Amino acid sequence: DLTPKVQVYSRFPASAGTKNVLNCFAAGFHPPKISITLMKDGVPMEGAQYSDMSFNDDWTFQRLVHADFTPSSGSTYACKVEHETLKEPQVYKWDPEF
Amino acid sequence: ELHTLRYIQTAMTDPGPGQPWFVTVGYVDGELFVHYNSTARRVVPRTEWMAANTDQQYWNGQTQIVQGNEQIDRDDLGTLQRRYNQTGGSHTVQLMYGCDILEDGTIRGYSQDAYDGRDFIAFDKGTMTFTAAVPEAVPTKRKWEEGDYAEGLKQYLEETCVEWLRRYVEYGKAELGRRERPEVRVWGKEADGILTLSCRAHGFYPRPIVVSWLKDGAVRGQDAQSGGIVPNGDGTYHTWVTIDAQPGDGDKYQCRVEHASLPQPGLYSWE
Amino acid sequence: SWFRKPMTR
């Protein structure tokens, strides 16, 4: 009904050793209170920037969380999302595609 | 040429931890240009074309227009709780207003309000009356109609909104009207006798994009799953389209990307 | 420019 639809992706096509930005976008959620955290191997990804909160015509909220990172082989990158509509915290794994 | 100006307002009782209770932003053609929060208490630009074209007089003046709205929403959070007979808890007041300059020259003005994600007061520009969606919106409807506040709001959406939007478009002519080429990557994954072909587009501008999967030169629609158009932190956009196929048919599949930056639709494959 | 709200709800 009002659960957040989460997508994990990179700014530029992923390459090992090359500088990139890891984005986590959640949309279609209400109430606005949300906990979106970018994680590297099950631990938060240092200095993450939280973009200005927005909502569409149906009054459902959306938020983007981005952080500068260097993708490395053998490291698992994921996004932890906590919301009132969800019973348990949802973890979304990032597919490196390389 | 289509040009839109949208201003959204959010008043919260449960932000919650380390977050501002009052957040409000502006949009020019879907791009974030102005921001205000209850913690900082100052209007800060979000685009380079906005800061370089406006003076200190404008930034100081805009802050007080919002500061007054912050006070109004602070009182309204308490006023609406008494009407619905609520002691406390998580409550949100949302406001959406703006003007749209259509391709046919028609100017569309709108002003909508909501309480806890459900419609409250919607302004009707034609009848010059505030429409009530809930029975708790009737005292607001009665108050806003006697005082003729609809005349000042109609003056804004038709005159003030259009004049400023036309100036903002002129300030960011090179930024809003730019063409940014997307970086397309095609990757396949085989599991349980199903080959999933993923087509991902990175960092394109403007927002409209048509990504379609083709098999033997013919488009395959119903089988394709998309995640829509998602944004990036630098103002660019992202999208992904996946298709389920039989193993040993990957070479027959081709991803077609239709964008304004590309002169002809780009054809990509897993190679 | 933001609209200055002329009245409370």
Author numbering:
A (entry chain B): 1 to 98
B (entry chain A): 1 to 271
C (entry chain F): 1 to 9
From the publication, what sentences describe this entry?
Highly polymorphic class I molecules encoded by the major histocompatibility complex (MHC) are crucial in the adaptive immune response to viruses and some intracellular bacteria, binding peptides inside the cell and presenting them on the cell surface to CD8 T lymphocytes. In this paper, we find that two other haplotypes known to confer resistance to Marek's disease also have low cell surface expression and promiscuous peptide motifs, and examine the structural basis for promiscuous binding in three low expressing molecules. Second, we show that peptide-binding repertoire and level of cell surface expression are inversely correlated in both chickens and humans, indicating that this relationship is a fundamental property of class I molecules.
The B14 peptides all share two features, generally a medium to large hydrophobic amino acid at P2 and one or more basic amino acids at the end of the peptide. A wire model of BF2*1401 shows small hydrophobic and polar residues in and around the beginning of the groove and reveals many acidic residues at the end of the groove, well placed to interact with the basic residues at the peptide C-terminus. Structures of BF2*0201 and BF2*1401 show promiscuous binding via hydrophobic binding pockets for the anchor residues at peptide position P2 and Pc, with the class I residues at positions 24 and 9 playing supporting roles, and with residues lining the pockets explaining the relative size of anchor residues. However, analysis of BF2*0201 and BF2*1401 shows promiscuous binding by chicken molecules using anchor positions into pockets B and F, much like many mammalian classical class I molecules.
